[PDB]
Amino acid sequence: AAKIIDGKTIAQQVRSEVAQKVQARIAAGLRAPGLAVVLVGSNPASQIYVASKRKACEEVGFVSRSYDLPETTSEAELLELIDTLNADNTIDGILVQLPLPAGIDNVKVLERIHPDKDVDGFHPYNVGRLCQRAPRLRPCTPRGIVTLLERYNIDTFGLNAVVIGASNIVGRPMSMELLLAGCTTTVTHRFTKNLRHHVENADLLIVAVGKPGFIPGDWIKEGAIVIDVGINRLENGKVVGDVVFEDAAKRASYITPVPGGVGPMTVATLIENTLQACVEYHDPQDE
Amino acid sequence: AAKIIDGKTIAQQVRSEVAQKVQARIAAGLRAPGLAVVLVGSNPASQIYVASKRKACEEVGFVSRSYDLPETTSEAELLELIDTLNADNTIDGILVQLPLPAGIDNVKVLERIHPDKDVDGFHPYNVGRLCQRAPRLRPCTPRGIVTLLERYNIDTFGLNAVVIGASNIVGRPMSMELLLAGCTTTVTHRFTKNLRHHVENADLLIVAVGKPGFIPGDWIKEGAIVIDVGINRLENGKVVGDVVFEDAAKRASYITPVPGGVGPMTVATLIENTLQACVEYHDPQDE
C-alpha cells in the first residue's frame, strides 16, 4: 500500500513560497525577479512548454520578458540577443526553449548564457559545480526530485539508489544530486547487463527511459521509493509512466503518480532557481 | 593468477609518444607545447610533486615556465600572475600545485585559469563537459586509469564497475569517465551500507579511500579488474595500496601494483593534456 507523493501539491506549495518572497521584496521597495523565455520557431510541443513556464512565472509575480522569434533567425542574431540579455540587470534568468532550429550550434548558443542566469542548470559550469559538491544553479528536474524527498521527510543518507537512465538532462545530474544527499548511487543505461539485478536491491528508484511500462512492478524491491520521470502519451489517449503503477504501487512504500508527480516539480524548480539567482547573485540584500 | 598492469611501462610509452609529436612540430617550424608550474610555499611533498612534473615535461620537449613563489604572496598577486599566464600564447597549460596557503581563496584562484589551459582538469567547466558526454581537458587521474584499460585491450562496455571513493579528484570524475566507456557505474563512500555486497559483483574495481589494506582481497570478485589508486607509506618504510595485494592477486584477472600502477599514469596524462591543449586549442594546424 504505497503512499502517494503528490508532486502537484508540493509544487503548489513551492510556487506559493516564491510568491511571498516576491511580495516581501516589492513591499520593501525592491524589484521583482525577471525571467526571459526565448522561443524560436513554432514547435507545438514547445509552445505548451513555454506557455506553462510563462504562466507560473506571472503567477508568482516575476517580470516576464518573452521573446517569440521566427524559425529563420540566424545564430549570430540569437547570440546577439543573449549577450544583450546577460547585460540586463532586470533579467535574473534566461530560458532558451529546445528544440532549437537545426543548423544553429546548440552548445555555442546555450553556453553563451552567463552561468548565474542559467536557471535551467544546463551550462557545464553549474554542472561541474554540482559534481564538485559546490552547487550553484542546479538542473531543474533532478533538483525537483530531491525537493520531493525532502517534503515527505525521507532520510536519503545511506540509501541504495539506482538511476535507470544516464542522460544529460536527468540521469547523470540525478546521480551527482543523490551523492550530495548521501546515497550509494548506481547509474544504468543501455549497455547494462542484468538490469533486474540492480533494481532488486534499490531502496530508492528513479526511472527515466521514456518507454511505457518498461519496468515491471514485479522488479521493484518491497518498500522501495519509486520516482517515475517518464511521461508517455499512448495513442489511446492515456498517459502512463515508465513503470507499471498498479503492481509497483502494491510493493513500494512511496511512489510518484503520472501525471502529477515529477512533471509539476520541474517548473516549480525553475521558478525557485530564478528567485535564487535574484536574491543571491544579481541583487542580494547583504548584511 | 592476476595479470600485472604495468603502469610504469605504459606511462613510459605515453611519454614517448608525446615526445615524437613534439619533435615533429619543431622539425616543421612550429613551437613546442609550454607548461607553467606554479609552486607557492615550501611544502616538502609539493616539492617532490612539482619536480616530478617538471622533469617529465622537459623530458618530452616542452618549454618549462616555472614559478616558485613565497608562501607570503597575496591572493591579488597570485591572480594577477594567472591573468598574465592566460594571455601568453607560449603557455598551453597552467598547473598551480596544491595545497595552497590557507587564507587564499582556493576556488577563486583555480577557476581563474582559462579552461583551455586547465591541464589538470579541475575547472568546473571541463568537469561539466566530461559529465555531458562532451569532454575537453579531462581530470588526470581518472583519464590515466582509462588509458590503462585501453593499453591492455579491455572491453569496458557492459562491465559492472564500482568506485570506492566519491572524491572531487578521483571518485566522482571516475564515474563520469566510466559511463562514457559504457560501464554500469556504482559510486560508494562513507554512508554506504554493506560495502562488501557492492564489491562482490563488480567486474571492475577502482579503490580510492587512502587507507592501507582497507579492502581485503577476500571481497574481490573472482576475475575482477583491480585498480588501486591508494598510496600509503607505512611507518616501517613500506609502500602499500588500499587493497591487500597478496590475496587480491590470486582472485583477480588483472591488477595494478603499488607503486608503479596508477601513480605514473597521473603525470603521463598531464603531459598528454598539455600536448592536447596546444595541438587543438592554442596553435592547431587546420586543414
Side-chain angles (χ1 to χ4, degrees):
Chain A
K3 183 96 175 302
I4 294 304
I5 298 177
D6 196 340
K8 198 180 187 300
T9 303
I10 298 306
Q12 196 279 282
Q13 298 175 15
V14 173
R15 251 181 283 107
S16 162
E17 296 160 6
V18 169
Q20 303 182 35
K21 312 225 215 305
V22 180
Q23 303 172 38
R25 285 198 110 233
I26 299 173
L30 303 164
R31 74 177 177 68
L35 182 65
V37 187
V38 179
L39 174 50
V40 173
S42 227
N43 183 304
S46 296
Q47 292 170 61
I48 302 177
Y49 286 142
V50 167
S52 178
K53 301 168 193 273
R54 286 179 177 162
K55 179 191 177 173
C57 169
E58 289 187 77
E59 177 191 317
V60 295
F62 294 1
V63 181
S64 280
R65 189 74 71 82
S66 298
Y67 293 82
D68 288 311
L69 299 180
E71 186 177 72
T72 67
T73 23
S74 69
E75 186 188 89
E77 290 189 304
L78 203 43
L79 290 178
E80 189 186 273
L81 175 60
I82 290 180
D83 295 6
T84 293
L85 286 184
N86 283 154
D88 185 8
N89 313 317
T90 319
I91 303 308
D92 299 291
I94 296 174
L95 190 279
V96 176
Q97 181 70 235
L98 292 164
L100 197 69
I104 303 301
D105 193 341
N106 260 260
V107 313
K108 182 156 161 60
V109 175
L110 299 179
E111 287 182 12
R112 188 66 158 243
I113 304 176
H114 184 105
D116 292 8
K117 295 213 182 181
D118 179 54
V119 291
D120 217 76
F122 283 162
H123 204 292
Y125 179 85
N126 294 131
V127 176
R129 290 294 290 228
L130 174 74
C131 302
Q132 298 182 313
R133 234 182 197 278
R136 297 282 291 183
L137 285 177
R138 309 136 80 139
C140 301
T141 312
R143 181 54 188 136
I145 298 181
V146 178
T147 305
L148 290 174
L149 296 167
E150 286 172 15
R151 304 293 175 127
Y152 276 76
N153 300 326
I154 305 294
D155 198 347
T156 49
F157 292 91
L159 289 182
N160 179 206
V162 177
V163 181
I164 307 82
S167 65
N168 285 12
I169 56 170
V170 184
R172 285 174 178 182
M174 195 60 252
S175 62
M176 290 296 118
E177 197 79 79
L178 287 176
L179 281 170
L180 198 153
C183 304
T184 303
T185 307
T186 300
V187 173
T188 65
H189 42 67
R190 70 167 145 143
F191 303 116
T192 297
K193 301 179 175 181
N194 203 11
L195 172 67
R196 178 177 174 128
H197 181 256
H198 300 277
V199 178
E200 175 187 316
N201 312 99
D203 302 306
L204 176 71
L205 206 59
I206 297 189
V207 199
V209 294
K211 291 185 174 179
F214 182 69
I215 294 292
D218 181 77
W219 299 5
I220 285 65
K221 175 231 189 66
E222 187 120 43
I225 299 182
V226 189
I227 297 288
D228 198 335
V229 184
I231 307 180
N232 305 105
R233 294 195 166 109
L234 306 177
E235 252 293 66
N236 66 296
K238 285 191 183 306
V239 170
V240 297
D242 295 338
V243 172
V244 183
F245 194 93
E246 188 212 352
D247 310 321
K250 296 170 185 176
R251 313 262 281 167
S253 62
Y254 279 81
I255 188 161
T256 64
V258 178
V262 171
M265 280 311 314
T266 304
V267 182
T269 300
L270 172 88
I271 291 317
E272 209 172 46
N273 286 2
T274 303
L275 183 58
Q276 173 189 131
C278 176
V279 164
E280 292 183 22
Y281 313 147
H282 304 103
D283 183 44
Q285 298 307 276
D286 292 334
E287 306 181 300
Chain B
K3 183 96 175 302
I4 294 304
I5 298 177
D6 196 340
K8 198 180 187 300
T9 303
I10 298 306
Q12 196 279 282
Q13 298 175 15
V14 173
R15 251 181 283 107
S16 162
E17 296 160 6
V18 169
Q20 303 182 35
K21 312 225 215 305
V22 180
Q23 303 172 38
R25 285 198 110 233
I26 299 173
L30 303 164
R31 74 177 177 68
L35 182 65
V37 187
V38 179
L39 174 50
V40 173
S42 227
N43 183 304
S46 296
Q47 292 170 61
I48 302 177
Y49 286 142
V50 167
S52 178
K53 301 168 193 273
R54 286 179 177 162
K55 179 191 177 173
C57 169
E58 289 187 77
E59 177 191 317
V60 295
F62 294 1
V63 181
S64 280
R65 189 74 71 82
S66 298
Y67 293 82
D68 288 311
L69 299 180
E71 186 177 72
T72 67
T73 23
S74 69
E75 186 188 89
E77 290 189 304
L78 203 43
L79 290 178
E80 189 186 273
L81 175 60
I82 290 180
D83 295 6
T84 293
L85 286 184
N86 283 154
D88 185 8
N89 313 317
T90 319
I91 303 308
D92 299 291
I94 296 174
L95 190 279
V96 176
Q97 181 70 235
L98 292 164
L100 197 69
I104 303 301
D105 193 341
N106 260 260
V107 313
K108 182 156 161 60
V109 175
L110 299 179
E111 287 182 12
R112 188 66 158 243
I113 304 176
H114 184 105
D116 292 8
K117 295 213 182 181
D118 179 54
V119 291
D120 217 76
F122 283 162
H123 204 292
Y125 179 85
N126 294 131
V127 176
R129 290 294 290 228
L130 174 74
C131 302
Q132 298 182 313
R133 234 182 197 278
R136 297 282 291 183
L137 285 177
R138 309 136 80 139
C140 301
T141 312
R143 181 54 188 136
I145 298 181
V146 178
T147 305
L148 290 174
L149 296 167
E150 286 172 15
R151 304 293 175 127
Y152 276 76
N153 300 326
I154 305 294
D155 198 347
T156 49
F157 292 91
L159 289 182
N160 179 206
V162 177
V163 181
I164 307 82
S167 65
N168 285 12
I169 56 170
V170 184
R172 285 174 178 182
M174 195 60 252
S175 62
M176 290 296 118
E177 197 79 79
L178 287 176
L179 281 170
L180 198 153
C183 304
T184 303
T185 307
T186 300
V187 173
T188 65
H189 42 67
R190 70 167 145 143
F191 303 116
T192 297
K193 301 179 175 181
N194 203 11
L195 172 67
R196 178 177 174 128
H197 181 256
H198 300 277
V199 178
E200 175 187 316
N201 312 99
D203 302 306
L204 176 71
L205 206 59
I206 297 189
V207 199
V209 294
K211 291 185 174 179
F214 182 69
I215 294 292
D218 181 77
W219 299 5
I220 285 65
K221 175 231 189 66
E222 187 120 43
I225 299 182
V226 189
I227 297 288
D228 198 335
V229 184
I231 307 180
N232 305 105
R233 294 195 166 109
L234 306 177
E235 252 293 66
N236 66 296
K238 285 191 183 306
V239 170
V240 297
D242 295 338
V243 172
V244 183
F245 194 93
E246 188 212 352
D247 310 321
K250 296 170 185 176
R251 313 262 281 167
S253 62
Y254 279 81
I255 188 161
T256 64
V258 178
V262 171
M265 280 311 314
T266 304
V267 182
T269 300
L270 172 88
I271 291 317
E272 209 172 46
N273 286 2
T274 303
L275 183 58
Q276 173 189 131
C278 176
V279 164
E280 292 183 22
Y281 313 147
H282 304 103
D283 183 44
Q285 298 307 276
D286 292 334
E287 306 181 300

